From Swiss-Prot:
Family designation: Belongs to the protease inhibitor I57 (SspC) family.
Assembly description: Forms a stable non-covalent complex with prematurely activated/folded SspB.
InterPro entries per record: Protease_inh_b-brl_dom, Staphostatin_A/B, Staphostatin_B
Protein encoded by which gene: sspC
Protein name: Staphostatin B
The species this protein was found in: Staphylococcus aureus (strain MW2)
Amino acid sequence: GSMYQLQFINLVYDTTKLTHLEQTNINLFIGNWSNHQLQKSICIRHGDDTSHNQYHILFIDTAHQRIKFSSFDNEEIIYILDYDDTQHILMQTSSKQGIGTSRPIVYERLV
Ligand SMILES: [Cl-]
Ligand SMILES: [Cl-]
């Protein structure tokens, strides 16, 4: 079959400043995920100041199991990840000063 494109998302954050539940919630999204229709995979990991593909977390929603983040290189585009279960998360796109938020797209964990 076809090869996919793989995008790295290295979330940059100091764990020692978070609550246990905020850590839990980020951890729901760490992993390797794919969407068949886009032929796209994302690899979400905790990175650091040295990393490439750096993203900054804007909000950790422990009420609804979501995180919001933006790339270091563009503060305007906001990504939202919604937890479903251990094998499924959903991505939406919003923005700092635009109108609207996109419909969720399911990413499945690569067994
Ligand atoms: Cl095949
Ligand atoms: Cl980079």
